[PDB]
Design a protein around this nucleic acid. Sequence first.
RNA 1: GACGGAAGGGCACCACCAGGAGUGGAGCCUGCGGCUUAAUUUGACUCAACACGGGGAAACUCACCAGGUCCAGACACAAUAAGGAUUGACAGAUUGAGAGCUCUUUCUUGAUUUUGUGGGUGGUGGUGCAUGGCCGUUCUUAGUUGGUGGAGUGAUUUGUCUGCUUAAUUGCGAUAACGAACGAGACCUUAACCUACUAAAUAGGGUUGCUGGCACUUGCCGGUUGACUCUUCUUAGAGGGACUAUCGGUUUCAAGCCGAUGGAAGUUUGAGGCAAUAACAGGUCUGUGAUGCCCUUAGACGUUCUGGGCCGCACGCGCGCUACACUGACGGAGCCAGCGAGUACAACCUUGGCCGAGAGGUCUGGGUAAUCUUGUGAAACUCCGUCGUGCUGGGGAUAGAGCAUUGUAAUUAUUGCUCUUCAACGAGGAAUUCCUAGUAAGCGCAAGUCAUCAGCUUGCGUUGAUUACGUCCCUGCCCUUUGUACACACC
Lengths: 96, 223, 53, 67, 106
Amino acid sequence: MLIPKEDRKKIYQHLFQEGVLVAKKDFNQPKHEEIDTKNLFVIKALQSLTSKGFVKTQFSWQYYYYTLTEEGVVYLREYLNLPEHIFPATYLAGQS
Amino acid sequence: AIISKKRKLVADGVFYAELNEFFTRELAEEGYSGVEVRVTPTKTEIIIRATKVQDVVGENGRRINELTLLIEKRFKYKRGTIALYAERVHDRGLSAVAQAESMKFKLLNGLAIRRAAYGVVRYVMESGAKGCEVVISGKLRAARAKSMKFADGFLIHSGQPVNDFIETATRHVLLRQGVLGIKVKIMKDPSRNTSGPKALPDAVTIIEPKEEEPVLEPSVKDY
Amino acid sequence: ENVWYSHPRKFGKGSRQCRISGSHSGLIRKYGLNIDRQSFREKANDIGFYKYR
Amino acid sequence: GRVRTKTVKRASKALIEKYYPKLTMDFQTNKRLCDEIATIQSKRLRNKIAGYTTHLMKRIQKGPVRG
Amino acid sequence: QEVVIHKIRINLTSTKVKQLENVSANIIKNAETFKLVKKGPVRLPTKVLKISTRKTPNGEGSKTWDTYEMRIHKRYIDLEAPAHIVKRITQITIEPGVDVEVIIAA
RNA sequence: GACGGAAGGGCACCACCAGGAGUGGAGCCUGCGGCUUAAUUUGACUCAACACGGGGAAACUCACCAGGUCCAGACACAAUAAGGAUUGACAGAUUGAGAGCUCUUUCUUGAUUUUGUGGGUGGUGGUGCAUGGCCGUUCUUAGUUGGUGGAGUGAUUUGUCUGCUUAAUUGCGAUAACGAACGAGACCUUAACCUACUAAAUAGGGUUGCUGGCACUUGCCGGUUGACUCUUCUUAGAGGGACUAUCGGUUUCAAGCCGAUGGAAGUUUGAGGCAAUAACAGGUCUGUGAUGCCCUUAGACGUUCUGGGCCGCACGCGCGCUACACUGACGGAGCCAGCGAGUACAACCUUGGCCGAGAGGUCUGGGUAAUCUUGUGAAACUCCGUCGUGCUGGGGAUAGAGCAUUGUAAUUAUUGCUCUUCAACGAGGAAUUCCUAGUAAGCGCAAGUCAUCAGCUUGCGUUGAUUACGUCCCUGCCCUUUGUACACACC
Ligand SMILES: [Mg+2]
Ligand SMILES: [Mg+2]
Ligand SMILES: [Mg+2]
Ligand SMILES: [Mg+2]
Ligand SMILES: [Mg+2]
Ligand SMILES: [Mg+2]
Ligand SMILES: [Mg+2]
Ligand SMILES: [Mg+2]
Ligand SMILES: [Mg+2]
Ligand SMILES: [Mg+2]
Ligand SMILES: [Mg+2]
Ligand SMILES: [Mg+2]
Ligand SMILES: [Mg+2]
Ligand SMILES: [Mg+2]
Ligand SMILES: [Mg+2]
Ligand SMILES: [Mg+2]
Ligand SMILES: [Mg+2]
């Protein structure tokens, strides 16, 4: 919960770049893959997001899978401050 | 690169298992049935079989794309080395897993359990299976718990023809008083097999001889 | 963020942690499975292991 | 120990009924005939059936037999 | 132009025997079509991966065990050809479950 | 139905005969009591608890105890709202302590939060008598069922049986039943045979080059991936092969059993894998982000560090190891296996060279493996020697000291080695386990856990018997006939 804001911002940015965040169930872990933060910081943030809509979470084998809803996307837009016609994977990352 | 061959194989299997688990977790509402993995040159091919294909697809690259991304994040592949393909589970009744899922859904909804079981059995029969066996274990009215058993048709139990023809499914259903367990068996028709043996090993059927009026004294056909 | 929050956990039953459950008990670490026994048994056919003899 | 099952004996009987001409005496030939005519799944089962048929044939050449 | 004959070793590994055999057959057919210097589909001793588990989850009961075994089929084929031809041969004739592997060059 | 201190008939080395090998005795490992303890965490108590929870705990594990640390108090609503919400904090006293744990401090930190109230989440907390799944057990025994038809007013019954057979409700038969299904069998995996195919410098040979040693005639043993070719051994694909075959007895001349003969194979060919109907208040909520409900929820039963405990000993029992010697012991020397396993982001297996009585170091390698460890030249064994039956050179427990190794940490010896010490036990009472052929037993090796530790475990080979080839006497189970005032079923 006691999260330095820069880290949070970074996490948000990462999410917007992707739309998907996969994180190990590892509190007491120094660094997360891709993001320059502790795993715990990520995981708790995602939990918080979930708790008021925003993010959908899945568990499978000690390894959290986080996806986003449209409300979540909106929230991200509001907070991170990205305009419109931008990345995610929710409204097509490209064409697959 | 540079890992023992047996070990590599084991890891592959493990990965597959993990994937299956993930699919079970996620695509329950869509009615997930089976995964296929093809490690071809350049790209890994994940084929998904689910009851709701459209849902899986999403907004043509909304849900599937997300799934792909997740996979990439997990097993660490390049953005473009994983492809996903949703498919029709051909004959939903001949899939036990699907049936189990359906049953679970029904239970969740709040259907009469016995009735539901009967319906399932009927469906199975329609699908053209030799036999169905549905065991529903748990607390079905009153605290003292009992496994109810709803069956129809053939069924085998012992031998190697079990893993050949009998398809099994086990799903536990969560309710606010305790857990149910739904165990579904389907005996597939031996004649309608595609790949493998086309009958039960004990079944011996002989062909009929043809009619004879033979003697009538020598004679020769000449050219 | 504390001054410390860890003791040396590089080996023993502390280091090895299951894929599925996270159990430190009855762990099959042969062929690099790292799956605890019961779970492995449950999902053995998915790995490709079979009961022949 | 060695006592033949329904699925051997009955089948053998049926075979005999159908094909007494051309199902004669010695084992190998009988086996071959079985392979040709009957849709036997396993090899061992087929072999057993053939053996039974041979036995039946042998019994026959000493008088009639029930069933 | 390109045709300089190398030393090519091709590894095949699977759990399914029939599939592997089919793959081997396909490879041989390809070789025949291209009619090159050939060493046969050499079969390596099948590797049985063993596991022993108490059938019980809890421990109580008569102590009964499992023998979960996974059999590995490893087979290799030796060809003397240009590499491009080998690649062409191996780009097709791929069946799911069988691992196709190429050493390439001496 | 269940039961019977009723009568019949079966079956089984978890029954007994004919024997073997023994445990129970002894010293020790190690389970479980009991005791003891700050704690010596618990689960399980006839088969079906007791070297079991893959439970070989130095911490971790970890559930226990003595203490400290942290918030991993979602989110909802409010009091401060920057003149600071609140985070951070070396120096010593503080403290086990380069824990700002704090109390000395007065420098930072910027609305993340903290103070309450709704609300949760985590729990190797509780209940397996609320459950799932899995498993164990009735039982791997031969059992179980419905469709017609018959007998009953009916619950029911017959089929599913007097016999003889079989490992088997396996069959032959007899017959108000007839034809079926599940189980048994079939099956599948494996172990046996293949001079018949298809193959190989990641298997093995042949000739032949060069080459080393021989007798010295051509001949014998060698070293070399120098050539060429082969597939018997090798591996593993596709096949084949045994079906009790052929014959002889014996039996309603049936099913079958017995004896030869041929054969790789004649105990279901050897061994398993799977395994019905109905169940058990059998075991697990200490495998689970399987889980109901209850407890708990910031002096937490969440955790996380730190030390200890699970291992303590007047004592019961439960698997085991070592032995009580001359069929040996100790020294040489000879010298043969099969299952395995094995790292690049780590530190796997580790030959070969030097150093060391060891243990070990060290340098170098080879191997992600039919390629290197590895021909795992393993033990038991066989050959010649020293002692010859004396708690003796049998035997090895406690001990004392040193030298190594793993790890952050070895006292409460982790373990390896060195010298010394030499205890109990001259084959084990009342009892009772396991077993019928490549089996019993002897002997190692191997993976499993593992950083380190094997007296344990799944496998594997090596050496290889004795004695039945049977019967209900005992024991347990099953069936039939009977009795019952039991049907929560003789507790
Ligand atoms: Mg059957
Ligand atoms: Mg069977
Ligand atoms: Mg018993
Ligand atoms: Mg203990
Ligand atoms: Mg052990
Ligand atoms: Mg838990
Ligand atoms: Mg119970
Ligand atoms: Mg009737
Ligand atoms: Mg009856
Ligand atoms: Mg005769
Ligand atoms: Mg058998
Ligand atoms: Mg109980
Ligand atoms: Mg609980
Ligand atoms: Mg035991
Ligand atoms: Mg070797
Ligand atoms: Mg002495
Ligand atoms: Mg230890």
